[PDB]
Amino acid sequence: MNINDNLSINSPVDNKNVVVVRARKTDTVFKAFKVAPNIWVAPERYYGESLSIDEEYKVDGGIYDSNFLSQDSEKDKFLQAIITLLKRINSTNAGEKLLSLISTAIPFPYGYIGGGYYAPNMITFGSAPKKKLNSLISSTIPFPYAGYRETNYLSSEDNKSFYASNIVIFGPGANIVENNTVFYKKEDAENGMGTMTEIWFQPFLTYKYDEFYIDPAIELIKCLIKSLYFLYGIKPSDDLVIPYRLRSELENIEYSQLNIVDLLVSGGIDPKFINTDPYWFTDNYFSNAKKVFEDHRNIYETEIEGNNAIGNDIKLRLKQKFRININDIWELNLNYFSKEFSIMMPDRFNNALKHFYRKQYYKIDYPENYSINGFVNGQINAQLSLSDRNQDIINK
């Protein structure tokens, strides 16, 4: 499908595409816009992180601004930038398939309140008056008809309205040059059920690496690919990490390490040393996640399928969700989209760039500096201005 276009920061709240919903269970509330089915954009800073932190807690290479994305003009620019990036992603067959998969990869809903996925309880309604006394002549309907309790939804401020949601694209947190991908519920993120995924994204700043600027669309795509692990509930144990770079600068032997998801998503040359045709690196996670994915697939195939007290909006999406295999998610990375979109990206140690060279940030404007066709005049000859925030970078 195509991303919704008729959205503005001042667009009225209609409870269909423009909603004002609570952030998790806190007393904080934010405005969200539906761009695609089960896909939302919240053009504000991320609520979960304090926008002003200690000087000791500021990370190296980061930029901190508590007043960024506070005005409504900045919010509208952010919303339009995210819409443009999503349109560019959806303008290619591969990116369109990725967005459709995200839209259909709803987290597995919990069963009936009493526990179970099998069947409703039924109930009788109606009567024909009379001679005959037509008391048992009546209609029979399944009682709940929707008892499955979905975990992917944003709750309105009054806590009386609920809107389906798989992906919410927020602004940056404390650090405005740090994109991130976080999960709604860790338990649901690791048990195969899946959970809603939130994204912190910065579309206004890029950095020049070896004569070309990083395309924000492919950064968003990295976040979207990482969201598949959370949507499918196949987030590994936090301890599953691989050695990424030997810290030869230090006097003693020390290894930098990386989470397996970041390695398998970021792409480049590094993951080819871990993903081999004969596997040389294995863990309980791969077999266990395959097992739990098969378990949820069986739950659908045996119980959810043969249950016509469900709307198609849930079971058809589950059907399309289980059309994919786990190995498909594992093999999916950024190199595929680099080829499909013809987008240049760092290829060696792309997650350790903060060590090898000092990033300088350039301001991206939409649609003058970036259109649906990517950067105007490409990633090489783009006319970008050095951002005013290069002086605010933390040097530790």
Report the nearest approach of another protein to the CB of residue 113 (Å): 9
Distance CA 301, CA 323 (A): 12
Distance CA 284, CA 240 (A): 9
State the number of CA atoms in the 13 A half-sphere of 345 facing the CB.
Answer: 26
Cβ–Cβ under 8 Å, residues 146 and 313 = no
CA 214 from centre of chain: 20
- C-beta closer to another protein: residue 164 or 332: 164
- C-beta closer to another protein: residue 112 or 285: 112
User: What's the order of all strands across the beta sheet hosting 205-209?
Assistant: 212-213, 205-209, 361-363, 385-386
> Which residues, 6+ apart, have CB-to-CB distance to 222 below 8 Å?
179, 265, 266, 334
Report the nearest approach of another protein to the CB of residue 145 (Å): 4
CA 83 from centre of chain: 15
Report the nearest approach of another protein to the CB of residue 17 (Å): 14
- C-beta closer to another protein: residue 162 or 281: 162
Distance CA 303, CA 326 (A): 21
If one counts every other C-beta atom within 10 angstroms of the C-beta of residue 311, the result is 11
- C-beta closer to another protein: residue 118 or 145: 145
Report the nearest approach of another protein to the CB of residue 110 (Å): 16
Report the nearest approach of another protein to the CB of residue 321 (Å): 17
Report the nearest approach of another protein to the CB of residue 151 (Å): 19
Give me the residues that bind another protein (CB under 8 A), please: 12, 15, 123, 125-129, 134, 137, 139, 141-146, 308-309, 311-313
- C-beta closer to another protein: residue 314 or 352: 314
- C-beta closer to another protein: residue 142 or 378: 142
Report the nearest approach of another protein to the CB of residue 139 (Å): 5
- C-beta closer to another protein: residue 117 or 341: 117
Establish whether the linkage from the previous residue to 236 is cis, with ω within 30° of 0: no
The residues facing 103 across adjacent strands are none
Which tokens hold the place of 342? 């013809």
Integer angstrom CA distances of residue 164 from 36, 293, 314, 319 = 11, 22, 11, 17
Nearest to 145 by CA among 179, 112, 108, 120: 120
- C-beta closer to another protein: residue 258 or 310: 310
Report the nearest approach of another protein to the CB of residue 10 (Å): 14
